[PDB]
């Protein structure tokens, strides 16, 4: 039979059968209970709208993501999300399909063990396998080397790989991602008068960020230009009218990636953690990693980031090496495409964690040889 390539993610759940080009169903991972009282009788009001249904009734819900930073903080809601994904968005019972979840690097063990225990006890799948979210993004590019920066919505991690041999001592995981950029944008919008507070209006600020923000090639020059002319002010229409005008908030929101001091984080930007991740590698594979830097994940879709990052790394790196940044147009679904490719391989067909194996060793089987 065919395998189910699910990809929990944090912000958008992407799923679909193995062997295709794009995920079949992509929908936000939010579960929102209603918060008001409700007076109409017999309206058929449910107790929790999940997935894309709660992005249409969000006016009277309190949306809450069940995955904070890669890790899962609310297991009941995550179980509800998985149940919805299997039964309503794909309509395939899990009793007859292997599953291939994905997990960020350096995550707590208990999260992974609970994930496998749920998949084997509640949904009762035949066999499931957990894979690191960066190796798949390297599969999708058709490479076999390269250092991949997978800046998702929950957590940004940077896994270097050479000739198929991952370097476990050079993984640099940073917890700045799309959600923190949304919060920072929502916080700097208040400098013009627009106040978004409700958890429903966070979605509106996310839409503003997606449609308007861009990464500046040079930060100081843009700050000077936006403060003199008015060629940058782009307007946007809220879900009820009252258009708003975003000035130099456009390139200040995604600039947080390269200067995490804006949101008070100490660490260095995504332009310098890649160079540090390279320098921890051996001295003889640094040229190949320099030449095959891969971008993935949703947050790396800002217009103009593949040039800013290249300029920064070229500034840091030695002058002789060639710096090349692979930015495929299908960046958002790169991890899932790689997952489909991996699940479609014949050599991989014996790596699944078969159910009888789980019955013999318990949920701690995932840390064992079947990784």
């Amino acid at each position: 039979t065919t395998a189910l390539v699910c990809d929990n993610g944090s912000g958008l759940v992407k799923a679909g059968f193995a062997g295709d080009d794009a995920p079949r169903a992509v929908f936000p991972s939010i579960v929102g209970r209603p918060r008001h009282q409700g007076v109409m009788v017999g309206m058929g009001q449910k107790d929790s709208y999940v997935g894309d249904e709660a992005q249409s009734k969000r006016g009277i819900l309190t949306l809450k993501y069940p995955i904070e930073h890669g890790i899962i903080t609310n297991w009941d809601d995550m179980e509800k999300i998985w149940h919805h994904t299997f039964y309503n968005e794909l309509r395939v019972a899990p009793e007859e399909h292997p599953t291939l979840l994905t997990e960020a690097p350096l995550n707590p063990k208990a999260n992974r063990e609970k994930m496998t225990q749920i998949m084997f006890e509640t949904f009762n799948v035949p066999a499931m396998y957990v894979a690191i979210q960066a190796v798949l993004s390297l599969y999708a590019s058709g490479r076999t080397t390269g250092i991949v920066l997978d800046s998702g919505d929950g957590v940004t991690h940077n896994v270097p790989i050479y000739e198929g041999y991952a370097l476990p001592h050079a993984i640099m995981r940073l917890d700045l991602a799309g959600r923190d950029l949304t919060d920072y944008l929502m916080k700097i919008l208040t400098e013009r008068g627009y106040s978004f507070v409700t958890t429903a209006e966070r979605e509106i600020v996310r839409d503003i960020k997606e449609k308007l923000c861009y990464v500046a090639l040079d930060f100081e020059n843009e700050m000077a230009t936006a403060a003199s002319s008015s060629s940058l002010e782009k307007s946007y229409e809220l879900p009820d009218g009252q258009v708003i005008t975003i000035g130099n908030e456009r390139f200040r929101c995604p600039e947080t990636l390269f200067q995490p001091s804006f949101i008070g984080m100490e660490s260095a930007g995504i332009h310098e953690t890649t160079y540090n991740s390279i320098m921890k590698c051996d001295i003889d594979i640094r040229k190949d990693l320099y030449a095959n830097n891969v971008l993935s994940g949703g947050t790396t879709m800002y217009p103009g980031i593949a040039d800013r990052m290249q300029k920064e790394i070229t500034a840091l790196a030695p002058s002789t090496m060639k710096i090349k940044i692979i930015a495929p147009p299908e960046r958002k679904y790169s991890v899932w495409i790689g997952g489909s490719i991996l699940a479609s391989l014949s050599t991989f067909q014996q790596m699944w964690i078969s159910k009888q194996e789980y019955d013999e060793a318990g949920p701690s089987i995932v840390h064992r040889k079947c990784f």
Binding site: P303, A306, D307, P329
Partner: protein
């Protein structure tokens, strides 16, 4: 006539949504074209420089 008006409204809404999507797609692809053209110009300059280096060396 009210039902007719509702149908007209929904058709207009769908058409506008498709128009917005096409606008976004064209914007993205045009940005890609601009970036690639700049890269090609720089590459021609680099190629001339490399040939000069070959000759002198």
């Amino acid at each position: 006539i009210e039902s007719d008006l509702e149908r007209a409204e929904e058709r207009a809404e769908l058409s506008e949504g498709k128009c917005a999507e096409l606008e976004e797609e064209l914007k993205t692809v045009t940005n890609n074209l601009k970036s690639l053209e700049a890269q090609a110009e720089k590459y021609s300059q680099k190629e001339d420089k490399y040939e000069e280096e070959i000759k002198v060396l």
